[PDB]
């Protein structure tokens, strides 16, 4: 088959700013399995009908995984804007594929508080589609050069998702996997059973 277990059943997911990227090709990928992820979850599909994904063929398939806030998952869509969309992960307008997101209360929560999930906060410019930024140099908000000190008008750009089970649904961790299908002049190999 096709290695979805390594992408959908991993112990931990990468932070939203340093999101992962998995290359999937030359496999028999059965997308009907992913309907049992949770009793209720998001399965928005852009440009392709999910009911006919089990017979189409694609040259390559990409998988991107991260963890974001519960009420902030609506920003992962073409033509959207916000905090994740224009600082961490930008989806192109001409996007084809599907996005999958399900609640992860029991796996990414701590009573003390989880601090391993970070999201970038300050940037001078937004992000082009499918572009990463892992730089952690101190951000400058004013004019005078702060040359590496956390005063004011000069702050650390990365904050933390202080996850905790006592939070409301809007602040609960949500694991997101974005499949990015495409076809080229090369032969297609990723076909359903």
């Amino acid at each position: 088959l096709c290695p979805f277990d390594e992408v959908f059943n991993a112990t931990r997911f990468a932070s939203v700013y340093a999101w992962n990227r998995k290359r999937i090709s030359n496999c028999v990928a059965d997308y009907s399995v992913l309907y049992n992820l949770a009793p209720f979850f998001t399965f928005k599909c852009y440009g392709v009908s999910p009911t006919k994904l089990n017979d189409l063929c694609f040259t390559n398939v990409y998988a991107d995984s991260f963890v974001i806030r519960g009420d902030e998952v609506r920003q992962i869509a073409p033509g959207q804007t916000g905090n994740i969309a224009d600082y961490n992960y930008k989806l192109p307008d001409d996007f084809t594929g599907c996005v999958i997101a399900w609640n992860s209360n029991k796996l990414d929560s701590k009573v003390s508080g989880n601090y391993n999930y970070l999201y970038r906060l300050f940037r001078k410019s937004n992000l082009k589609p499918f572009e990463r930024d892992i730089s952690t140099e101190i951000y400058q908000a004013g004019n005078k050069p702060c040359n590496g000190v956390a005063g004011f008008n000069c702050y650390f750009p990365l904050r933390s998702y202080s996850f905790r089970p006592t939070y409301g649904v809007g602040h609960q961790p949500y694991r997101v996997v974005v499949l990015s299908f495409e076809l080229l002049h090369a032969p297609a190999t990723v076909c359903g059973p």
């Epitope: 796996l107 701590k110 601090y115």
Partner: antibody, heavy 121, light 108 residues
Framework: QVQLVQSGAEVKKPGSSVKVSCKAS????????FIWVRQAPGQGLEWMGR????????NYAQKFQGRVTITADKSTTTAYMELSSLRSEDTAVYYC??????????????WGQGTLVTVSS | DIQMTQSPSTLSASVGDRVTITCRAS??????LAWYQQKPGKAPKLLIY???SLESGVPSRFSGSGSGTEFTLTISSLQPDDFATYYC?????????FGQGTKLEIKR
């Protein structure tokens, strides 16, 4: 890859305070969180607290509240542990450990060599 | 202050045998746990974290498993490096406590 060195043997009177320094060498310093752990001669490992110098969250054990301060300098790439109002039962071996963002900020991936800290008269 | 209990506190086996150790908590700690082994006279080193993930650089013979309030560590092949004291540690809710520790020794 990563190596850590702690200070030497330390002896102090019961009516005083101790500060011990932990030095880190290797890897990025913006993804590290420092943890300090005590091991007495006649028991197992005991926990004090964890700090995250980059994001500024520091917490200590309930027993040691108001008695232990842990602080680090980003440029010096070192860590400091300070204990106040020593008692005759405080003699132990003190270990310096550190987490990792790609691992967990709360586990102790790498450990120092430990300093012998005893209280006498 | 979730209390961790380790049993047995005295354990012995043979070379090439298989050994299993359990580690019980007092409340539900989700899937946050760790295992260190401290050779007498040296410093401890992490072996397993999250109760399932094996820390890189540790030989493959080590293994761990658990879901909640009941966690186990199993070593497939015993080696002369494997005789030390093993400890638990939970890091859900503050005051991350430790365990009593289990002693391993050769069967004379």
């Amino acid at each position: 890859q990563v190596q850590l060195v702690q200070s030497g043997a330390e002896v102090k009177k019961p009516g005083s305070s101790v500060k011990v320094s932990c030095k880190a060498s290797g890897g990025t310093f913006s993804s590290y969180s420092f943890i300090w752990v005590r091991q007495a001669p006649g028991q197992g490992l005991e926990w004090m607290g964890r700090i995250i110098p980059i994001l500024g969250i520091a917490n200590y054990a309930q027993k040691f509240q108001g008695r232990v301060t842990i602080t680090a300098d980003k440029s010096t790439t070192t860590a400091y542990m300070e204990l106040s109002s020593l008692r005759s039962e405080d003699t132990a071996v003190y270990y310096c450990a550190r987490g990792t963002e790609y691992g967990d900020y709360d586990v102790s991936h790498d450990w120092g060599q430990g300093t012998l800290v005893t209280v006498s008269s | 202050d979730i209390q961790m209990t380790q049993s047995p506190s005295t354990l012995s086996a043979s070379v090439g045998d298989r050994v299993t150790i359990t580690c019980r908590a007092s409340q539900s700690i989700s899937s946050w746990l760790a295992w260190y082994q401290q050779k007498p006279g040296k410093a401890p080193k992490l072996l397993i974290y999250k109760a399932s993930s094996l820390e890189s650089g540790v030989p493959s013979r080590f293994s761990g498993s658990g879901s909640g309030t009941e966690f186990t560590l199993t070593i497939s092949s015993l080696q002369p490096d494997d005789f030390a004291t093993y400890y638990c540690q939970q890091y859900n809710s503050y005051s991350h406590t430790f365990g009593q520790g289990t002693k391993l020794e050769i069967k004379r």
